[PDB]
Amino acid sequence: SKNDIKAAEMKERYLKEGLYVLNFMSSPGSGKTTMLENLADFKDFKFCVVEGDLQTNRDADRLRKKGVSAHQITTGEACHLEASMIEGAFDLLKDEGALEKSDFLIIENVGNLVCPSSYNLGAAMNIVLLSVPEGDDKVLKYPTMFMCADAVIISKADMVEVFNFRVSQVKEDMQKLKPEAPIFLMSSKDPKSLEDFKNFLLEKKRENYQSTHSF
């Protein structure tokens, strides 16, 4: 419970700051940073970002180039984020005034479809991206990751035809694993899909949905 304890303590601070916290998990390159870049275009969607990578400030810089307050966590070798890692980034974002102006604090986890599924970060929602080029068979291959999802995003949905990707396969696999979890088709080329997902998040904050998932 060491991480579990720390996650619970971070959740105290999230609520204190009036933040709805999202934890995005996927394979490397599923489209997380691009999605956040596109979400920044919705003025009614106010958020700051904690970025998890092994090295470089490449994702954080892309986001800051778009006007999003973002801070990079460099894990060095760790394949995942842990609750204790969030604290440092949280404190900086607080001191910078980023938290005061945000309705959402968004955690972009280390690219990894396995290990981040085992670490509670105190998030209200844990959302998993599965990109079309990865294959429509991945849900059952990484069941523990997809079972922690409060929502699944099929990203790069513009690529469905060229990859002969079967949305039905993902739907049916998720039906077995976690039927309550909604599935979203998303493309960076489809503003309407971004808008739909944004409104979904807004409503979730409204309800104050808080995942009870055990990691």
Ligand X SMILES: Nc1nc2c(ncn2[C@@H]2O[C@H](COP(=O)(O)OP(=O)(O)O)[C@@H](O)[C@H]2O)c(=O)[nH]1
What residues make contact with ligand X under the rule CB under 6 A?
26, 28-34, 59, 111, 155-156, 158-159, 187-189
DSSP 27: S
Options 27, 33, 126, 131; binder of Mg ion; rule CB under 5 A: 33
Q: Which does 155 bind (CB under 5 to 8 A by kind): Mg ion, Ni ion, ligand X, none?
A: ligand X
Least distance in angstroms from the C-beta of 59 to Mg ion: 4
Instruction: Please report, in angstroms and rounded to a whole number, the separation of the first and last CA atoms in the chain.
Output: 10
Q: What are phi and psi of 165, to 5 degrees?
A: -75, 130
Query: Which residue, among 204, 208, 186, has the nearest Cα to 39 in the 3D structure?
Result: 186
Would you say 35 or 185 has its CB closer to Mg ion?
35
- Strand 151-155 and strand 183-185: pairing? parallel
Site for Mg ion in 137-196 (CB under 5 A): none
| Contact footprint for Ni ion (CB under 5 A) | 79, 115
Could you say which residues in the range 44-73 bind Mg ion, by CB under 5 A?
59
**Which residue lies nearer to Ni ion by CB, 79 or 160?**
79
Of 56, 181, 59, the C-alpha closest to 108 is: 59
The C-alpha atoms of residue 76 and residue 82 are separated, in whole angstroms, by: 13
Binding-site positions for Ni(2+): 79-80, 115
